[model samples]
Target: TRDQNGTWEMESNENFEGYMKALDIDFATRKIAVRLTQTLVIDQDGDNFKVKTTSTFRNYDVDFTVGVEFDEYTKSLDNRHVKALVTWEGDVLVCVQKGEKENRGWKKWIEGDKLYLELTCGDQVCRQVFKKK
Candidate 1:
């Protein structure tokens, strides 16, 4: 169990704008998000941890263990509630969200000098990359 790791901030968000758009986000919302900076705050305690996504536009909190089922709220993320669970697939953190849509949620991993996150909802997919802050 480790409590510390390199903290990273969103550097590039690929297809993020599209994903939001697919979810029916308005032009104003998209503009605000594009100009905003998203921060990932990870609190580690043994094998359990909490991930908090903070931004000028909105904030989201999600907590989970290696193999636990949890209720997750996307908050400003399309403003939806879904049951989400995360598991470690080798070095990658794989997540499956069960809700109204099929094949949703995200997957995360660290590659070289960047943190990668894949977010999906409905027929849309978004990939976000981050660098240490």
Candidate 2:
């Protein structure tokens, strides 16, 4: 946090479209989402965190405090509502989402100089890594 300002761009997108499919994403968006590269921008403001997953076709923006429960509406992604909570587990940030879909969650952490993101829903898991810029 501490006035962070740079960004991380995705190097490899592994099965993101499959995760979207588990969330029941639309055909058009799912098709385009799989091909789009994404940028991850995050910041800590006071007690809350801001995150934006922006790419070619859409931007998934979210804000919440760690360990606080919030209504997470995946508007730009799957367009569903869920109770989301962020928890800090060691150096990793984990977000668990509760909705009609089971076992939906994501984790973000830094491995070496790369940013790693793992998303899960149902039986699908999407693992991606990004390089700093």
Candidate 3:
């Protein structure tokens, strides 16, 4: 089993504004998100996992099992309903979200003792790297 990696912060985000723009998020939400300290707390047990996002103003959680599709309501993030699936490829965790937006998903992996996450929407890609605590 891969060793448990705990809470993560110190995010270095790239193209988040562009990504949010593509998602049709309001300007105020995007503005507030850019200033907040976003934290990612993730854990895994067998094929099940929970990924939680925390910020000063908002929080979002996604809980699912690999290879299984679940209905996910991305409240506070996009406030949309979608089909979500997670899969493991090598050491990376990939999430495929199917819904209104085309080619929407994300990938997470660890490198150099740092955890990296990349969110995709349409042609926009937002990348975040967090330092382990």
Candidate 4:
């Protein structure tokens, strides 16, 4: 089992500005988000999972189970309501968000001491790397 039960601290983000812009994030929020380091706290058990993404400016918490679809209100990120369906593809946790935007989703995987997150919106994709702490 790919146990993702740890605290991870952000190391780097690639094309984060474009990803935020694609989601129509405001200029001020984008500026703050780009500069702030993020932390992810995840707890996983069998099929159930809870994740919290925290930063100095904003935070987001989500709870869902594998193969279960949940309604997610993206408060600070995009301010949109999306039905998120998460499934496991091998060792990766792949999520598909069904809502107003097309091709909007994210994937998370763990490798070594690093946790990788990839966010997608339309034609933009952002990759964030975190080190387990």
Residues 35-78 of candidate 4 have per-residue lDDT tens digits of 44899999998999999999887788889999989898888678
- The predictions' CA RMSDs to the true structure, in order, are 2.6, 2.4, 1.7, 1.2
Q: Give TM per candidate.
A: 0.82, 0.89, 0.91, 0.94
lDDT string for model 1 (12-125, tens) is 787878778876678788877763368887776766877888887777776788678887665666666788887877777778988766778788887877788898877888
Ranking by TM-score: 4, 3, 2, 1
Lowest lDDT block of 10, candidate 4: 28-37
Candidate 3, run of 10 with poorest lDDT: 1-10
| Cα lDDT, all candidates | 0.76, 0.81, 0.84, 0.91
Ranking by lDDT: 4, 3, 2, 1
lDDT of 4 at 100: 88
Q: Quote the lDDT for 58 in model 1.
A: 76
Worst 10 residues of 2 by lDDT: 1-10
Best by lDDT: 4
Error of 3 at 90 (Å): 1.6
Candidate 1 ranges beyond 4 A from true positions: 1-4
List residue ranges in candidate 3 displaced over 4 A.
1-4
Error of 4 at 114 (Å): 0.8
Worst 10 residues of 1 by lDDT: 1-10
